[PDB]
Curated annotation (Swiss-Prot), chains A, B:
Annotated function: Non-selective ion channel permeable to monovalent and divalent cations, including Na(+), K(+), and Ca(2+), with higher permeability for Ca(2+). Activated by multiple factors, such as temperature, voltage, pressure, and changes in osmolality. Activated by cool temperatures (<23-28 degrees Celsius) and by chemical ligands evoking a sensation of coolness, such as menthol and icilin, therefore plays a central role in the detection of environmental cold temperatures.
Domain of life: Eukaryota
Domain notes for this protein: Cooling agents bind within a pocket formed entirely by the S1-S4 helices that opens to the cytoplasm.
Localization per Swiss-Prot or TrEMBL: Cell membrane; Membrane raft
Modifications the protein undergoes after translation, according to the UniProt entry: N-glycosylation is not essential for but facilitates cell surface expression, multimerization, association with lipid rafts and ion channel activity.
Tissues of expression: Expressed in dorsal root and trigeminal ganglia. Specifically expressed in a subset of pain- and temperature-sensing neurons. Not expressed in heavily myelinated neurons. Not expressed in neurons expressing TRPA1 or TRPV1.
Effect of loss of the gene: Trpm8-deficient mice have severe behavioral deficits in response to cold stimuli.
Name listed for the protein in its UniProt record: Transient receptor potential cation channel subfamily M member 8
Homology family: Belongs to the transient receptor (TC 1.A.4) family. LTrpC subfamily. TRPM8 sub-subfamily.
Assembly mode: Homotetramer. Interacts (via N-terminus and C-terminus domains) with TCAF1; the interaction stimulates TRPM8 channel activity. Interacts (via N-terminus and C-terminus domains) with TCAF2; the interaction inhibits TRPM8 channel activity.
Coiled coil spans: 1-34
Amino acid sequence: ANDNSEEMRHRFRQLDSKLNDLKSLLKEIANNIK
Amino acid sequence: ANDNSEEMRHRFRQLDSKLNDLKSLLKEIANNIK
């Protein structure tokens, strides 16, 4: 059983998780500046 | 041997590398403003 969907899938997970904590940092800046 | 997984894969790499140095620039702004 050989699969490459898990590889690109976890690439998608790590990519949008980095987008998630970038969103958290942008909300943190939006709170701390105001 | 024909493969298109390398093409979309390196699209994923260039896309999340641009997200990486965007993350670096956002951390740079978060450090320099405070």
